Amino acid sequence: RIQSEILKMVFATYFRILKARVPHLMGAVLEGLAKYAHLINQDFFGDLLEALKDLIRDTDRDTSRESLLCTVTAFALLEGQDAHNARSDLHLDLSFFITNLYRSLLSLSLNPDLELGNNKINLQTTTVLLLRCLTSVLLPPWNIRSVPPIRLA
Amino acid sequence: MRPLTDQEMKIVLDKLANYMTDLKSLIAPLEDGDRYVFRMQKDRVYYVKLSIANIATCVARDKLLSLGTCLGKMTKSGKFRLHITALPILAQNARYKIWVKDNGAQPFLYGSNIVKAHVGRWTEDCPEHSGCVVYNMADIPLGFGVTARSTAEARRLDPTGIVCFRQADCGEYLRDE
Amino acid sequence: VYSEKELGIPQLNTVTPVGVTKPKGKKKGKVFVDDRESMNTILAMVEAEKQGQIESKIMRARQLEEIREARRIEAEKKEAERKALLEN
RNA sequence: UGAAGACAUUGUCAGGUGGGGAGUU
Protein backbone atom coordinates (compact mmCIF):
# COMPACT_ATOMS: atom_id res chain seq x y z
CA ARG A 1 0.00 0.00 0.00
CA ILE A 2 2.78 2.46 0.86
CA GLN A 3 4.54 1.52 -2.38
CA SER A 4 1.40 2.46 -4.31
CA GLU A 5 1.14 5.79 -2.48
CA ILE A 6 4.78 6.68 -3.20
CA LEU A 7 4.40 5.50 -6.80
CA LYS A 8 1.42 7.85 -7.14
CA MET A 9 3.42 10.85 -5.91
CA VAL A 10 6.63 9.95 -7.78
CA PHE A 11 4.87 9.40 -11.10
CA ALA A 12 2.59 12.44 -10.76
CA THR A 13 5.61 14.70 -10.35
CA TYR A 14 7.29 13.05 -13.34
CA PHE A 15 4.33 13.74 -15.63
CA ARG A 16 3.74 17.32 -14.48
CA ILE A 17 7.36 18.13 -15.35
CA LEU A 18 6.87 16.58 -18.79
CA LYS A 19 3.68 18.59 -19.38
CA ALA A 20 5.32 21.89 -18.41
CA ARG A 21 8.50 20.91 -20.32
CA VAL A 22 11.19 21.97 -17.86
CA PRO A 23 14.40 21.84 -19.92
CA HIS A 24 16.80 21.03 -17.06
CA LEU A 25 14.66 18.23 -15.58
CA MET A 26 13.44 16.11 -18.51
CA GLY A 27 16.61 14.02 -18.58
CA ALA A 28 16.19 13.18 -14.90
CA VAL A 29 12.47 12.45 -15.31
CA LEU A 30 12.94 10.01 -18.19
CA GLU A 31 15.52 8.07 -16.17
CA GLY A 32 12.91 7.69 -13.44
CA LEU A 33 10.20 6.58 -15.87
CA ALA A 34 12.53 4.00 -17.40
CA LYS A 35 13.54 2.79 -13.93
CA TYR A 36 10.09 2.44 -12.36
CA ALA A 37 7.72 1.70 -15.26
CA HIS A 38 7.77 -2.03 -14.53
CA LEU A 39 6.31 -1.42 -11.05
CA ILE A 40 2.99 -0.05 -12.31
CA ASN A 41 -0.12 -1.45 -14.00
CA GLN A 42 0.15 -3.04 -17.45
CA ASP A 43 -2.37 -0.80 -19.19
CA PHE A 44 -0.32 2.24 -18.17
CA PHE A 45 2.81 0.83 -19.82
CA GLY A 46 1.40 1.29 -23.31
CA ASP A 47 0.35 4.80 -22.31
CA LEU A 48 3.95 5.69 -21.46
CA LEU A 49 5.06 4.87 -25.01
CA GLU A 50 2.18 6.92 -26.43
CA ALA A 51 3.12 9.84 -24.16
CA LEU A 52 6.70 9.59 -25.43
CA LYS A 53 5.50 9.78 -29.03
CA ASP A 54 3.59 13.00 -28.34
CA LEU A 55 6.71 14.62 -26.88
CA ILE A 56 8.72 13.67 -29.97
CA ARG A 57 5.97 14.95 -32.27
CA ASP A 58 5.88 18.21 -30.31
CA THR A 59 9.62 18.77 -30.73
CA ASP A 60 9.27 17.89 -34.42
CA ARG A 61 6.89 20.85 -34.65
CA ASP A 62 17.88 21.87 -27.75
CA THR A 63 15.06 20.27 -29.73
CA SER A 64 17.32 17.54 -31.13
CA ARG A 65 18.38 16.49 -27.63
CA GLU A 66 14.82 16.25 -26.32
CA SER A 67 13.66 13.96 -29.14
CA LEU A 68 16.76 11.81 -28.68
CA LEU A 69 16.11 11.65 -24.93
CA CYS A 70 12.63 10.23 -25.52
CA THR A 71 13.93 7.72 -28.07
CA VAL A 72 16.56 6.48 -25.62
CA THR A 73 13.86 6.07 -22.97
CA ALA A 74 11.53 4.17 -25.31
CA PHE A 75 14.13 1.52 -26.12
CA ALA A 76 15.28 1.29 -22.50
CA LEU A 77 11.66 0.67 -21.52
CA LEU A 78 11.47 -2.35 -23.81
CA GLU A 79 14.94 -3.64 -22.91
CA GLY A 80 13.53 -4.71 -19.55
CA GLN A 81 12.89 -8.43 -19.31
CA ASP A 82 9.29 -8.01 -18.15
CA ALA A 83 8.41 -5.62 -20.98
CA HIS A 84 10.25 -7.81 -23.49
CA ASN A 85 8.19 -10.89 -22.62
CA ALA A 86 5.02 -8.77 -22.88
CA ARG A 87 5.80 -7.35 -26.35
CA SER A 88 3.10 -9.30 -28.17
CA ASP A 89 0.53 -9.15 -25.37
CA LEU A 90 0.73 -5.40 -24.66
CA HIS A 91 1.26 -4.23 -28.28
CA LEU A 92 4.55 -2.41 -27.70
CA ASP A 93 5.84 -1.54 -31.18
CA LEU A 94 8.92 0.67 -31.52
CA SER A 95 8.51 1.06 -35.28
CA PHE A 96 7.65 4.73 -34.80
CA PHE A 97 10.88 5.44 -32.94
CA ILE A 98 13.01 3.44 -35.40
CA THR A 99 11.57 5.36 -38.35
CA ASN A 100 11.88 8.70 -36.56
CA LEU A 101 15.51 7.98 -35.68
CA TYR A 102 16.09 7.14 -39.35
CA ARG A 103 14.67 10.36 -40.82
CA SER A 104 16.68 12.43 -38.33
CA LEU A 105 20.15 11.12 -39.21
CA LEU A 106 20.70 13.56 -42.09
CA SER A 107 19.72 16.58 -40.00
CA LEU A 108 21.87 15.54 -37.03
CA SER A 109 24.99 15.67 -39.22
CA LEU A 110 24.55 19.40 -39.87
CA ASN A 111 23.95 20.15 -36.18
CA PRO A 112 27.08 21.85 -34.76
CA ASP A 113 26.16 21.36 -31.08
CA LEU A 114 26.62 17.57 -31.14
CA GLU A 115 29.60 17.92 -28.77
CA LEU A 116 28.41 20.70 -26.42
CA GLY A 117 28.63 18.45 -23.38
CA ASN A 118 26.12 4.89 -14.65
CA ASN A 119 23.11 6.76 -16.00
CA LYS A 120 21.16 5.13 -18.82
CA ILE A 121 19.00 8.04 -20.05
CA ASN A 122 20.24 11.30 -18.51
CA LEU A 123 23.42 11.81 -20.53
CA GLN A 124 24.85 15.23 -21.30
CA THR A 125 26.07 14.60 -24.87
CA THR A 126 23.66 14.35 -27.80
CA THR A 127 26.22 12.25 -29.67
CA VAL A 128 26.19 9.80 -26.75
CA LEU A 129 22.39 9.70 -26.90
CA LEU A 130 22.59 8.97 -30.63
CA LEU A 131 25.00 6.09 -30.01
CA ARG A 132 22.71 4.62 -27.34
CA CYS A 133 19.75 4.68 -29.74
CA LEU A 134 21.82 3.14 -32.54
CA THR A 135 23.11 0.40 -30.25
CA SER A 136 19.53 -0.42 -29.26
CA VAL A 137 18.36 -0.70 -32.88
CA LEU A 138 21.38 -2.55 -34.27
CA LEU A 139 22.75 -4.39 -31.19
CA PRO A 140 19.74 -5.16 -28.98
CA PRO A 141 20.22 -7.12 -25.75
CA TRP A 142 17.63 -9.62 -27.02
CA ASN A 143 17.40 -11.28 -30.43
CA ILE A 144 20.67 -9.82 -31.71
CA ARG A 145 20.87 -12.31 -34.61
CA SER A 146 17.26 -12.01 -35.73
CA VAL A 147 17.43 -8.30 -36.67
CA PRO A 148 15.94 -7.55 -40.12
CA PRO A 149 18.76 -7.20 -42.67
CA ILE A 150 17.05 -4.25 -44.39
CA ARG A 151 17.05 -2.26 -41.15
CA LEU A 152 20.75 -3.01 -40.68
CA ALA A 153 21.61 -1.95 -44.23
CA MET B 1 -10.17 -2.97 -66.77
CA ARG B 2 -11.76 -0.94 -63.99
CA PRO B 3 -10.74 0.10 -60.47
CA LEU B 4 -12.13 -1.65 -57.43
CA THR B 5 -15.35 -0.70 -55.68
CA ASP B 6 -15.36 -0.04 -51.94
CA GLN B 7 -16.69 -3.52 -51.13
CA GLU B 8 -13.98 -5.19 -53.23
CA MET B 9 -11.13 -3.07 -51.85
CA LYS B 10 -12.15 -4.04 -48.32
CA ILE B 11 -12.14 -7.75 -49.22
CA VAL B 12 -8.75 -7.52 -50.95
CA LEU B 13 -7.09 -5.67 -48.07
CA ASP B 14 -8.61 -7.98 -45.45
CA LYS B 15 -6.84 -10.94 -47.05
CA LEU B 16 -3.62 -8.93 -47.34
CA ALA B 17 -3.80 -7.83 -43.69
CA ASN B 18 -3.84 -11.52 -42.74
CA TYR B 19 -0.33 -11.81 -44.18
CA MET B 20 1.38 -8.39 -43.98
CA THR B 21 1.87 -5.57 -41.49
CA ASP B 22 2.40 -2.16 -43.10
CA LEU B 23 -0.27 -1.94 -45.76
CA LYS B 24 0.12 1.85 -45.73
CA SER B 25 3.49 1.38 -47.43
CA LEU B 26 1.77 -0.39 -50.33
CA ILE B 27 -0.20 2.69 -51.40
CA ALA B 28 2.15 5.40 -50.13
CA PRO B 29 3.35 7.94 -52.72
CA LEU B 30 6.69 7.45 -54.43
CA GLU B 31 9.48 9.95 -55.02
CA ASP B 32 8.39 10.97 -58.53
CA GLY B 33 4.80 11.73 -57.54
CA ASP B 34 3.47 8.27 -58.45
CA ARG B 35 1.67 5.55 -56.53
CA TYR B 36 0.52 1.95 -56.75
CA VAL B 37 -3.14 1.19 -57.45
CA PHE B 38 -5.43 -1.84 -57.67
CA ARG B 39 -7.10 -2.89 -60.92
CA MET B 40 -9.60 -5.58 -61.89
CA GLN B 41 -9.37 -7.38 -65.24
CA LYS B 42 -11.51 -10.51 -65.74
CA ASP B 43 -12.15 -11.08 -62.01
CA ARG B 44 -8.39 -10.83 -61.37
CA VAL B 45 -6.85 -8.17 -59.12
CA TYR B 46 -3.59 -6.56 -60.27
CA TYR B 47 -1.06 -4.54 -58.28
CA VAL B 48 0.49 -1.98 -60.63
CA LYS B 49 1.75 1.59 -60.74
CA LEU B 50 -0.73 4.33 -61.61
CA SER B 51 1.44 5.51 -64.51
CA ILE B 52 1.40 2.01 -66.02
CA ALA B 53 -2.36 1.78 -65.46
CA ASN B 54 -3.03 5.05 -67.28
CA ILE B 55 -0.93 4.14 -70.31
CA ALA B 56 -2.43 0.64 -70.42
CA THR B 57 -5.86 2.12 -71.18
CA CYS B 58 -4.90 2.26 -74.87
CA VAL B 59 -5.05 -1.54 -75.02
CA ALA B 60 -8.57 -2.83 -75.65
CA ARG B 61 -10.03 -4.84 -72.79
CA ASP B 62 -10.41 -7.98 -74.90
CA LYS B 63 -6.75 -7.61 -75.90
CA LEU B 64 -5.27 -7.04 -72.42
CA LEU B 65 -3.98 -10.11 -70.61
CA SER B 66 -1.71 -9.01 -67.76
CA LEU B 67 -0.70 -5.85 -65.92
CA GLY B 68 1.91 -5.46 -63.19
CA THR B 69 1.72 -8.08 -60.45
CA CYS B 70 -1.37 -10.27 -60.09
CA LEU B 71 -2.47 -10.72 -56.48
CA GLY B 72 -5.21 -13.23 -57.19
CA LYS B 73 -8.79 -13.58 -58.37
CA MET B 74 -12.21 -12.87 -56.95
CA THR B 75 -14.14 -16.12 -56.83
CA LYS B 76 -17.66 -16.60 -58.16
CA SER B 77 -19.14 -16.25 -54.66
CA GLY B 78 -17.36 -12.96 -53.94
CA LYS B 79 -14.26 -14.04 -52.02
CA PHE B 80 -10.72 -12.88 -52.73
CA ARG B 81 -8.07 -15.59 -53.09
CA LEU B 82 -4.35 -14.89 -53.16
CA HIS B 83 -2.05 -16.55 -55.69
CA ILE B 84 1.68 -17.25 -55.63
CA THR B 85 2.01 -14.42 -58.14
CA ALA B 86 1.57 -12.21 -55.05
CA LEU B 87 4.39 -13.83 -53.04
CA PRO B 88 7.04 -11.12 -53.71
CA ILE B 89 4.58 -8.64 -52.19
CA LEU B 90 3.84 -10.91 -49.23
CA ALA B 91 7.51 -11.51 -48.38
CA GLN B 92 8.38 -7.81 -48.41
CA ASN B 93 6.30 -7.03 -45.30
CA ALA B 94 5.55 -10.49 -43.95
CA ARG B 95 4.24 -10.57 -40.39
CA TYR B 96 5.03 -14.18 -39.44
CA LYS B 97 7.79 -16.20 -41.09
CA ILE B 98 8.60 -19.91 -41.16
CA TRP B 99 11.85 -21.42 -42.46
CA VAL B 100 11.94 -24.96 -43.86
CA LYS B 101 15.05 -27.08 -44.28
CA ASP B 102 16.21 -28.88 -47.42
CA ASN B 103 14.18 -31.97 -46.53
CA GLY B 104 11.07 -29.79 -46.30
CA ALA B 105 11.58 -27.45 -49.24
CA GLN B 106 11.13 -30.11 -51.92
CA PRO B 107 7.95 -31.57 -50.33
CA PHE B 108 6.58 -28.03 -50.00
CA LEU B 109 7.27 -27.28 -53.66
CA TYR B 110 5.40 -30.45 -54.60
CA GLY B 111 2.38 -29.26 -52.60
CA SER B 112 2.60 -30.71 -49.08
CA ASN B 113 1.98 -29.09 -45.71
CA ILE B 114 4.97 -28.30 -43.52
CA VAL B 115 5.56 -30.67 -40.60
CA LYS B 116 7.79 -30.41 -37.54
CA ALA B 117 10.68 -32.31 -39.16
CA HIS B 118 10.82 -29.65 -41.90
CA VAL B 119 10.95 -26.54 -39.71
CA GLY B 120 14.36 -25.00 -39.07
CA ARG B 121 13.30 -21.61 -37.74
CA TRP B 122 10.05 -20.29 -36.25
CA THR B 123 8.65 -16.84 -35.51
CA GLU B 124 8.06 -16.50 -31.79
CA ASP B 125 4.60 -15.57 -30.48
CA CYS B 126 2.65 -16.64 -33.57
CA PRO B 127 -1.05 -17.40 -32.95
CA GLU B 128 -2.79 -20.58 -34.03
CA HIS B 129 -4.32 -19.69 -37.42
CA SER B 130 -2.20 -16.91 -38.88
CA GLY B 131 -0.78 -16.17 -42.32
CA CYS B 132 2.89 -17.04 -42.67
CA VAL B 133 5.37 -16.83 -45.55
CA VAL B 134 7.61 -19.87 -46.08
CA TYR B 135 11.35 -19.55 -46.72
CA ASN B 136 14.23 -21.97 -47.01
CA MET B 137 17.61 -21.73 -45.26
CA ALA B 138 18.86 -19.21 -47.86
CA ASP B 139 16.02 -16.74 -47.13
CA ILE B 140 14.38 -17.56 -50.47
CA PRO B 141 10.56 -17.21 -50.27
CA LEU B 142 8.88 -20.43 -51.39
CA GLY B 143 5.24 -19.59 -50.71
CA PHE B 144 2.70 -18.82 -48.03
CA GLY B 145 0.11 -20.57 -45.92
CA VAL B 146 -1.83 -20.59 -42.66
CA THR B 147 -0.39 -21.93 -39.42
CA ALA B 148 -2.00 -24.97 -37.84
CA ARG B 149 -0.97 -24.52 -34.19
CA SER B 150 0.52 -21.83 -31.99
CA THR B 151 4.30 -21.60 -31.74
CA ALA B 152 4.28 -22.67 -28.09
CA GLU B 153 1.97 -25.61 -28.84
CA ALA B 154 3.92 -26.55 -31.98
CA ARG B 155 7.17 -26.96 -30.03
CA ARG B 156 5.72 -29.90 -28.07
CA LEU B 157 4.24 -31.47 -31.21
CA ASP B 158 5.28 -34.79 -32.72
CA PRO B 159 7.79 -34.77 -35.61
CA THR B 160 5.05 -36.00 -37.98
CA GLY B 161 2.62 -33.24 -37.01
CA ILE B 162 1.22 -30.50 -39.22
CA VAL B 163 2.56 -27.08 -38.27
CA CYS B 164 1.41 -25.09 -41.33
CA PHE B 165 -1.30 -25.50 -43.96
CA ARG B 166 -0.16 -24.93 -47.53
CA GLN B 167 -2.05 -22.40 -49.64
CA ALA B 168 0.36 -21.56 -52.46
CA ASP B 169 3.76 -22.84 -53.59
CA CYS B 170 6.16 -21.78 -56.33
CA GLY B 171 5.73 -25.18 -57.98
CA GLU B 172 2.44 -23.89 -59.41
CA TYR B 173 4.60 -22.09 -61.97
CA LEU B 174 5.29 -25.50 -63.50
CA ARG B 175 1.52 -25.94 -63.84
CA ASP B 176 0.95 -22.98 -66.17
CA GLU B 177 4.16 -23.55 -68.17
CA VAL C 1 -28.68 -22.32 -42.20
CA TYR C 2 -29.23 -20.20 -45.31
CA SER C 3 -27.86 -16.79 -46.22
CA GLU C 4 -30.07 -13.73 -45.87
CA LYS C 5 -28.68 -12.57 -49.22
CA GLU C 6 -30.16 -15.62 -50.97
CA LEU C 7 -33.59 -14.95 -49.45
CA GLY C 8 -35.41 -11.85 -50.65
CA ILE C 9 -35.53 -10.36 -47.15
CA PRO C 10 -36.61 -6.70 -46.87
CA GLN C 11 -34.10 -4.29 -45.36
CA LEU C 12 -35.09 -2.88 -41.98
CA ASN C 13 -34.66 0.64 -40.62
CA THR C 14 -32.69 0.63 -37.38
CA VAL C 15 -30.24 2.87 -35.50
CA THR C 16 -28.07 2.12 -38.52
CA PRO C 17 -29.86 4.01 -41.32
CA VAL C 18 -31.06 2.11 -44.36
CA GLY C 19 -30.30 5.11 -46.55
CA VAL C 20 -31.37 5.20 -50.18
CA THR C 21 -32.04 1.60 -51.17
CA LYS C 22 -31.55 0.20 -54.65
CA PRO C 23 -34.12 -1.84 -56.61
CA LYS C 24 -33.42 -5.55 -56.93
CA GLY C 25 -32.30 -6.94 -60.27
CA LYS C 26 -31.21 -3.52 -61.53
CA LYS C 27 -27.99 -1.57 -62.11
CA LYS C 28 -26.43 -0.82 -58.73
CA GLY C 29 -23.91 1.75 -59.93
CA LYS C 30 -20.26 0.92 -59.29
CA VAL C 31 -18.73 3.57 -57.02
CA PHE C 32 -15.02 3.17 -57.68
CA VAL C 33 -12.40 3.74 -54.99
CA ASP C 34 -9.09 4.89 -56.46
CA ASP C 35 -7.97 7.91 -54.42
CA ARG C 36 -5.18 7.44 -51.90
CA GLU C 37 -7.40 9.16 -49.33
CA SER C 38 -10.35 6.83 -49.97
CA MET C 39 -8.07 3.80 -49.71
CA ASN C 40 -6.62 5.08 -46.43
CA THR C 41 -10.03 5.13 -44.74
CA ILE C 42 -10.77 1.53 -45.72
CA LEU C 43 -7.26 0.47 -44.72
CA ALA C 44 -7.53 2.00 -41.23
CA MET C 45 -10.69 0.03 -40.44
CA VAL C 46 -9.10 -3.21 -41.66
CA GLU C 47 -6.01 -2.66 -39.51
CA ALA C 48 -8.14 -1.80 -36.47
CA GLU C 49 -10.21 -4.98 -36.84
CA LYS C 50 -7.14 -7.20 -37.16
CA GLN C 51 -5.43 -5.68 -34.11
CA GLY C 52 -8.52 -6.33 -32.01
CA GLN C 53 -8.25 -5.87 -28.25
CA ILE C 54 -5.78 -3.33 -26.83
CA GLU C 55 -5.36 -3.09 -23.06
CA SER C 56 -4.11 0.52 -23.03
CA LYS C 57 -6.84 3.16 -23.01
CA ILE C 58 -4.62 5.73 -24.75
CA MET C 59 -3.52 3.28 -27.45
CA ARG C 60 -7.17 2.39 -28.06
CA ALA C 61 -8.00 6.09 -28.42
CA ARG C 62 -5.20 6.69 -30.93
CA GLN C 63 -6.36 3.81 -33.13
CA LEU C 64 -9.87 5.28 -33.21
CA GLU C 65 -8.49 8.78 -33.77
CA GLU C 66 -6.45 7.86 -36.85
CA ILE C 67 -9.62 6.50 -38.47
CA ARG C 68 -11.34 9.81 -37.67
CA GLU C 69 -8.57 11.83 -39.32
CA ALA C 70 -8.65 9.48 -42.31
CA ARG C 71 -12.39 10.09 -42.66
CA ARG C 72 -11.93 13.85 -42.31
CA ILE C 73 -9.26 13.98 -45.02
CA GLU C 74 -11.41 11.89 -47.37
CA ALA C 75 -14.43 14.12 -46.77
CA GLU C 76 -12.30 17.23 -47.33
CA LYS C 77 -10.83 15.76 -50.52
CA LYS C 78 -14.23 14.80 -51.95
CA GLU C 79 -15.59 18.24 -51.03
CA ALA C 80 -12.77 19.93 -52.96
CA GLU C 81 -13.48 17.69 -55.94
CA ARG C 82 -17.13 18.76 -55.88
CA LYS C 83 -16.21 22.45 -55.72
CA ALA C 84 -13.75 22.17 -58.61
CA LEU C 85 -16.25 20.25 -60.75
CA LEU C 86 -19.11 22.60 -59.82
CA GLU C 87 -17.06 25.76 -60.43
CA ASN C 88 -14.76 24.72 -63.28
C1' U D 1 6.34 47.26 -58.63
C1' G D 2 9.71 42.56 -57.95
C1' A D 3 10.58 36.91 -59.13
C1' A D 4 10.87 32.90 -62.57
C1' G D 5 11.28 31.88 -67.72
C1' A D 6 11.26 30.90 -74.49
C1' C D 7 10.54 25.42 -70.55
C1' A D 8 5.92 24.71 -68.58
C1' U D 9 0.68 25.90 -68.90
C1' U D 10 -2.98 26.25 -72.55
C1' G D 11 -5.45 25.83 -77.25
C1' U D 12 -6.69 23.19 -82.49
C1' C D 13 -6.88 18.74 -85.58
C1' A D 14 -6.14 13.32 -86.13
C1' G D 15 -6.36 8.77 -83.54
C1' G D 16 -6.46 4.29 -79.12
C1' U D 17 -9.47 2.83 -74.95
C1' G D 18 -13.46 3.45 -72.25
C1' G D 19 -16.95 -2.74 -66.58
C1' G D 20 -17.63 4.81 -65.59
C1' G D 21 -21.77 9.20 -67.28
C1' A D 22 -26.02 10.50 -70.97
C1' G D 23 -29.51 8.66 -74.85
C1' U D 24 -31.97 4.69 -78.18
C1' U D 25 -33.86 0.05 -79.87
3-state SS of chain C is CCCCCCCCCCCCCCCCCCCCCCCCCCCCCCCECCCHHHHHHHHHHHHHHHHCCCCCHHHHHHHHHHHHHHHHHHHHHHHHHHHHHHHC
To what resolution in angstroms was this structure determined? Answer: 2.7
CB atoms within 10 A of CB B15: 19
C16 in A contact zone (CB under 8 Å): no
d(CA B141, CA B143): 6
Which chain B residues have any C-beta within 8 angstroms of a chain C C-beta? 2-6, 9-10, 13-14, 17-18, 23-24, 27, 29, 35, 37
Please judge whether B6 and C33 are an interchain contact, meaning their C-beta atoms are less than 8 angstroms apart. yes
Q: How far apart are CA C60 and CA B132, in angstroms?
A: 26
Q: Measured in angstroms, what separates residue A96's CA from nucleotide D1's C1'?
A: 49
Amino acid at site A99? T
Start-to-end C-alpha separation, chain A = 49
Closest nucleotide over all strands to B2 (CA to C1'): D19
C39 DSSP β-pair partners: none
CA distance A74 to B66: 46
Which residues lie across from B141 on neighbouring strands?
Answer: B135
The whole-number Å distance from B39's CA to D18's C1' is: 14
By three-state DSSP, how is residue A26 classified?
Answer: helix
Neighbours of A36 (CB within 10 A): 14
Do residues B120 and B170 lie in contact, with contact meaning Cβ atoms separated by under 8 Å?
A: no
DSSP at B94: B
Report chain C residues whose CB lies below 8 A from the CB of A50. Answer: 56, 58-59, 62
Distance CA B139, CA A146 (A): 12
Interface chains of chain A (3 or more CB pairs under 8 Å): C
Q: Which of C51, C55, C59 comes nearest A50 by C-beta?
A: C59
For residue C30, which nucleotide's C1' is closest to its Cα?
D20
Do the beta carbons of residue B151 and residue B122 sit within 8 Å? yes
- Cα separation values, B93 from A58, B20, B128, C30, C59, Å: 29, 5, 20, 31, 23
Which of B4, B13, B27 has its CB closest to that of C46? B13
Cβ contact, residue pair C33, B14, below 8 Å: no
Residue A142 to residue A146: CA distance in whole angstroms: 9
* Nearest CA distance, B105 vs chain C (angstrom): 30
Give me the helices (H) in chain A, please: 2-20, 26-36, 42-60, 63-78, 81-85, 87-90, 95-103, 105-110, 126-138, 149-152
Q: Which nucleotide has its C1' atom closest to residue B62's CA?
A: D17
Q: How far, in Å, CA of B161 to CA of B146, rounded?
A: 15
CB C31 within 8 Å of CB B5: yes
Please tell me whether any atom of strand D lies within 7 Å of the Cβ of B4. Answer: no
Q: Is C69 on the interface with A (CB under 8 A)?
A: no
C34 in contact with A, Cβ within 8 Å: no
Q: Name the strand (E) or helix (H) holding B173.
A: helix B172-175
Q: Which of C31, C36, C42 sits opposite B35 (nearest CB)?
A: C36
Tell me the nt nearest to B43, Cα to C1'.
D19
CB B80 within 8 A of CB B67: no
Q: Which residues of C touch B24 (CB under 8 A)?
A: 40, 43
Task: Please state the φ and ψ torsions of residue A99, each to the nearest 5 degrees.
Answer: -65, -45
Q: What residue spans of B3-139 are helical by DSSP H?
A: 6-17, 24-27, 50-55, 87-92, 102-110
Q: How far apart are CA A56 and CA A54, in angstroms?
A: 5
As a whole number of angstroms, the distance between CA B164 and CA C9 comes to 40
CA dist A16 and A12 (Å) reads: 6
Q: What CA–CA distance (Å, rounded) separates B51 from B16?
A: 23
Nucleic chain D: which protein residues 29-68 of B have CB below 7 A from it?
40-43, 57-62
C46 contacts B17? CB cut-off 8 A? yes
Instruction: Determine how β-strand B131-135 pairs with β-strand B162-169.
Output: unpaired
Q: Tell whether C56 lies on the interface with A, counting CB pairs under 8 A.
A: yes
What is residue A83's three-state secondary structure? helix
Cα B23 from Cα B92, distance rounded (Å): 11
